[PDB]
Structure 1
Amino acid sequence: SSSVPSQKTYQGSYGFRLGFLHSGTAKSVTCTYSPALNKMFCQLAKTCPVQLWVDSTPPPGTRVRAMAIYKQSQHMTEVVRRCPHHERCSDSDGLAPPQHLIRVEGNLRVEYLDDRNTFRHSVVVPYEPPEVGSDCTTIHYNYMCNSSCMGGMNRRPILTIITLEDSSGNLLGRNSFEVRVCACPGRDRRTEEENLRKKGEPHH
């Protein structure tokens, strides 16, 4: 890609990554992410638990921002906006505006990006040192827009990139994952893993 920046995960000097709690589905689960494909399956507006793990010392005041992009190369130049019905349905919820489908829980000093010259959409969160018992930064992400939203994604998946850097602007730990909401996380993971397993059969 020459137009938009690269989407390569860092996990370098800090070997920091995003950990999503997974659990085998029996018929219908909440959060189901495929490790092999690094894809996440959730329900519309369902809580998406994300864990920020690191290996080296991260700045006492590191800023970790998460942005949603159009991984769909066929529409990578198609930025996702807020639907007119989604903006008219609700106005205020938890400090997050309808314009942004991404939401953060347990926020302290977060800021929503929206440059008037670039019109970029991304949320930034302040560093919160690990707690005796976790050793990782637990951030809860909520998406108020599923791929089903013909007036939003239009059957186009989106990839979220969580970057952790200093105020000076130095990426220390930044990775990206795929988010798929369709009120069927266990059905998407079981159907994607079960359908992808066979990979064709008849043909002619």
Structure 2
Amino acid sequence: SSVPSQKTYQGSYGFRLGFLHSGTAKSVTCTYSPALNKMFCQLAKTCPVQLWVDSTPPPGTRVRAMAIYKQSQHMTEVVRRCPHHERCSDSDGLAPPQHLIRVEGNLRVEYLDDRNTFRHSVVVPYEPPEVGSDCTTIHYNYMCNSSCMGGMNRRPILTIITLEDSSGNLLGRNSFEVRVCACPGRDRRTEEEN
């Protein structure tokens, strides 16, 4: 019955989110606005979200992703894909067709159709940054447009990234708005001044 919380929780490991320095172009498939805490992207294309951490979590930690609607009147409704894209044949073999968020390039990905919250989530095991770098990058996929009628119907959503342990207890939480669009650059600068 309750709605997932969006409250920031850096926790005992200093869990913070990061995104690449991408600008408003036309050949831009993914760009994040620091001013609006909003990421703009197209359907089924790479969305790199890096996990910044001040102290490496222990082994067995998991990184979860969940979408909720931003407006208060729609927070109680599950974020699902539209019927067109659920019946559409774009499954990679690992993601169930109803899920909106996916993770590409990770064989250990798992998708949860929660039998009590009815809410979809994607979880991968946490791994410390690669040698030479300083953050863990996860590539997400949004398989439905924000404009997509019958699903979101132009309702803006948030993506909640949480750190959790073996049993799913909270270790960290961060969030950011996301819009799925055909032309992100034009749709970003349009909202970057209003």
Moved more, 137-146 or 119-128: 119-128
Deviations 1:140-197 (A, max 9, x none): 00101011111110110111111112114332221011110111211122111134xx
Deviations 1:15-58 (A, max 9, x none): 21121112222455222211122001111222111101101131
Change (3 A) 1:91 1:39: closer
1:104–1:141 Cα contact (<8 Å) kept: yes
C-alpha displacement at 1:60, in angstroms? Answer: 1.9
Match of 1:183 in 2: 182
2: CA distance, partners of 1:177 / 1:114: 22
CA RMSD of aligned residues (A): 1.9
Moved more, 173-182 or 25-34: 25-34
Match of 2:26 in 1: 27
Moved more, 131-140 or 167-176: 167-176
Match of 1:96 in 2: 95
1:28–1:187 Cα contact (<8 Å) kept: no
1:111–1:123 Cα contact (<8 Å) kept: yes
1:28–1:184 Cα contact (<8 Å) kept: no
Match of 1:135 in 2: 134
Moved more, 18-27 or 154-163: 18-27
2: CA distance, partners of 1:74 / 1:140: 30
Q: When the two structures are aligned, how many residues end up with a matched partner? A: 194
Give the ranges of 4+ consecutive aligned residues of structure 1 lying more than 3 Å apart after TM superposition: none
1: CA distance, partners of 2:157 / 2:93: 22
Change (3 A) 1:100 1:64: same
**Unaligned segments of structure 2, at least 5 residues:** none
C-alpha displacement at 1:94, in angstroms? Answer: 4.5
Change (3 A) 1:194 1:5: closer
Deviations 1:77-101 (A, max 9, x none): 1212232221222163241122001
**Unaligned segments of structure 1, at least 5 residues:** 196-204
Change (3 A) 1:26 1:123: closer
Aligned with 1:123: secondary structure? strand
Aligned with 2:175: secondary structure? strand
2: CA distance, partners of 1:127 / 1:108: 13
2:6–2:173 Cα contact (<8 Å) kept: no
Change (3 A) 1:81 1:135: same
Identity %: 100
Moved more, 167-176 or 133-142: 167-176
1:22–1:32 Cα contact (<8 Å) kept: yes
Change (3 A) 1:152 1:27: same
- Per the normalisation by structure 1, the TM-score is 0.87
Match of 1:40 in 2: 39
